[PDB]
């Protein structure tokens, strides 16, 4: 569920954090 969610929601989120993150180290 929520958590699961969240946890995507956190995650996702965290996504957002490999995406935008490794963007950065193709351009680098």
Known sequence: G???R???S???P???A???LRE???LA
């Open 14 to 16: 965290g996504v957002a």
């Open 24 to 26: 950065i180290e193709r």
């Open 2 to 4: 929520p958590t699961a």
């Open 18 to 20: 490999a995406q935008a």
């Open 10 to 12: 956190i995650l996702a």
């Open 6 to 8: 969240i946890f995507a």
